[PDB]
């Protein structure tokens, strides 16, 4: 009878060939459904993340509200069973980012696609958001993980080159040089994992747990550091930056960048 | 202050490189420490696996037990920090099974490398060995799994086909239908992540949690399991047993090959 998904839940799946994600980039059970006309997704978040930004129901409730705003999967069912959420999606539309651009030397087509993207962003009424994700709510957060060692570990973060010794240095930082806030759409974790693309043009958003209000530098600066990291070349951040037509607050970008550290 | 490794082994582990393991097939955190004269691994297990199989604390003293008697990677360091099992080792000899197969059609060469593990742990004095992994024991503590939903990730047990509609029915089918048992060493995971080859010989063995005394035919059923799925052919499985110089009791072969399911 102990199961983490339920009977209606079960039944919904038991058609479909279970091939699980092999990422397990968060805390999250992330599994591919292979059916013969189609594929599903069922994205599962243990009781400790209930509440979370990690919590799989915040990714449904954004879900829903991205509707007919960005590009993202259909809610096909949604639960709470024994302490887990359980979302089962549609398959997001379009080919992987990371997969799009993954054996080719074109950073450039990353960058125009993270300038669309926080174009996207900027035009989105938040109005209504079901989740204000504002430095206050994250470093509360935050806090929370800390001190229940849920926040995920960066192994590189043990490396003697590291600028903060530990956690608790880095959260003391954030909390002390916390920068104004200007609210607008942000995805939170904006990454080539988590977007796809169809003929050029962004077609789907997946991984919606930090999504909801907060600051456009944090999306801005998760982009600068994917560019940085992919390629050594600093000419591609002037590149992003003229692509959006804004200049480029340091002091901003710097923070949330240090913000993911620990997310 | 807070961390989930001492200052002592942060020390230790400074001038290294770190580098994640991609797998994450059990509950365990293994990263791999690159360095310039050598690479170490690092591998941790969580306060809710304490006294369990996954325990690395248990897989150190096995690994500690084990010097002299099997190629086993050398403990630099062991120690129980904030509810986190540690263990320090040194990088097996050898090349990954997995790896020195990757596509290369190879079977017999799989085969004669499992039949020797075999013979070789069968050869084991288990007269001091640390531990007993007698079917009392594992189902005692996959009782204590099911009961805190720390067994494994169910993904194929939710498929229409699969024999048993959930883990206890299945818990209780291993319950009843528990088989004698003639202890010797036991790997408890023999398969080609968890082994090494050097010259056609095995040079190494990890992920040792499991390892200890049980039924021989648990080792060899891993062995027929992984004929099975990786190679494919049912004549290497006829082959393995020639080798072995016994005939294959299928009904303990099914009822181990089963009992890893949960796990
Ligand atoms: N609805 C979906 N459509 C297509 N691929 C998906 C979908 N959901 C998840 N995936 C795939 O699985 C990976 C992990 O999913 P994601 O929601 O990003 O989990 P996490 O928060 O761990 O990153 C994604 O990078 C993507 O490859
Ligand atoms: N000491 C080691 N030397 C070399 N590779 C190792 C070592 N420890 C772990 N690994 C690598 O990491 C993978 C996961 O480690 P393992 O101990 O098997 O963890 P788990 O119990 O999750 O399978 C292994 O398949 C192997 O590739
Ligand atoms: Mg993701
Ligand atoms: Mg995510
Ligand atoms: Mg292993
Ligand atoms: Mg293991």
Redesign the interface.
């Known amino acids: 009878?102990?199961?983490?998904?339920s009977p209606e839940l079960?039944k919904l799946?038991?058609?479909?060939?279970?091939?699980?994600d092999?990422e397990?980039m968060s805390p999250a059970?992330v599994?591919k459904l292979v059916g013969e006309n189609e594929n599903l997704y069922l994205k599962m978040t243990?009781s400790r993340y209930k509440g979370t930004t990690y919590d799989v129901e915040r990714e449904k409730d954004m879900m829903l509200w991205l509707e007919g705003k960005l590009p993202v999967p259909k809610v096909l069912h949604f639960e709470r069973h024994?302490?887990w959420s359980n979302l089962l999606m549609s398959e997001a539309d379009g080919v992987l980012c990371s997969e799009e651009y993954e054996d080719e030397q074109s950073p450039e087509k990353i960058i125009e696609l993270y300038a669309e993207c926080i174009r996207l962003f900027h035009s989105i009424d938040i109005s209504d958001c079901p989740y204000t994700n504002s430095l206050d709510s994250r470093l509360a957060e935050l806090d929370y993980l800390?001190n229940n060692?849920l926040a995920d570990?960066d192994?590189?973060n043990?490396?003697?080159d590291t600028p903060f010794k530990?956690?608790?240095e880095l959260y003391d930082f954030l909390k002390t040089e916390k920068p104004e806030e200007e609210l607008v759409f942000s995805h939170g974790d904006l990454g080539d994992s988590n977007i796809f693309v169809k003929d050029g043009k962004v077609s789907g958003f997946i991984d919606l747990g930090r999504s909801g209000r907060a600051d456009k530098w944090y999306d801005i600066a998760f982009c600068v550091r994917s560019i940085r990291e992919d390629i050594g070349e600093e000419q591609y951040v002037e590149l992003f930056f003229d692509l959006l037509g804004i200049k480029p607050d340091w002091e901003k970008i710097k923070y949330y960048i240090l913000l993911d550290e620990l997310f």
Chains 1, 2 share one sequence.
């Open positions: 009878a102990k199961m983490r998904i079960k799946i038991e058609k479909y060939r279970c091939v699980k092999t397990g059970k599994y243990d024994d302490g800390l060692d570990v192994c590189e043990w490396e003697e530990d956690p608790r």
